[PDB]
């Protein structure tokens, strides 16, 4: 089925300061499904940075890439139809286009292959000026 996620939140911003991308879908979207960022520079590979699904009641799973754990957070409303990451401490490595992803087969927030993902949004540019 077509799903179009899409980002925002993606801007010029400068080392050592915060940025928080959101994405939700236009239209059909997903219930209880491990949603992801990813993200990759011109040339690169796609890199996982962060993964999120719905827990019992209110809670969610959460699991972090090594280059940003303490400083990146993913967080999720489902009201809203809206997942999120806040992004701390921003560094010049963390420029690239950052990615909304859904991985349908997962059934727990893990490592995400960018391989396996079976949906993926438009991208935001994230820049960060050393």
């Given at each position: 089925a077509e799903?179009?996620l899409?980002?925002?939140?993606?801007?010029?911003?400068?080392?050592?300061?915060?940025?928080?991308?959101?994405?939700?879908?236009?239209?059909?979207t997903?219930?209880?499904?491990?949603?992801?960022?990813?993200?990759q520079?011109?040339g690169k590979?796609?890199?996982?940075?962060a993964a999120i699904?719905?827990?019992?009641g209110?809670?969610?799973?959460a699991?972090?890439a090594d280059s940003?754990?303490?400083?990146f957070?993913?967080?999720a409303?489902?009201?809203?139809?809206?997942?999120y990451l806040?992004?701390?401490s921003?560094?010049?490595?963390?420029?690239?286009?950052?990615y909304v992803a859904?991985?349908?087969?997962?059934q727990?927030a893990?490592?995400?292959?960018?391989?396996?993902v079976?949906?993926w949004?438009?991208?935001?540019?994230?820049?960060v000026s050393?």
């Open positions: 799903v179009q899409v980002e925002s939140g993606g801007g010029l911003v400068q080392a050592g300061d915060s940025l928080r991308l959101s994405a939700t879908a236009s239209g059909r997903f219930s209880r499904a491990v949603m992801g960022w990813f993200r520079a011109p590979e796609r890199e996982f940075v699904s719905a827990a019992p209110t809670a969610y799973y699991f972090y940003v754990r303490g400083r957070s993913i967080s409303d489902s009201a809203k139809n809206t997942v806040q992004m701390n921003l560094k010049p490595e963390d420029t690239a286009v950052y859904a991985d349908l087969k997962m727990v893990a490592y995400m292959n960018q391989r396996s079976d949906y949004g438009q991208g935001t540019q994230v820049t050393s």
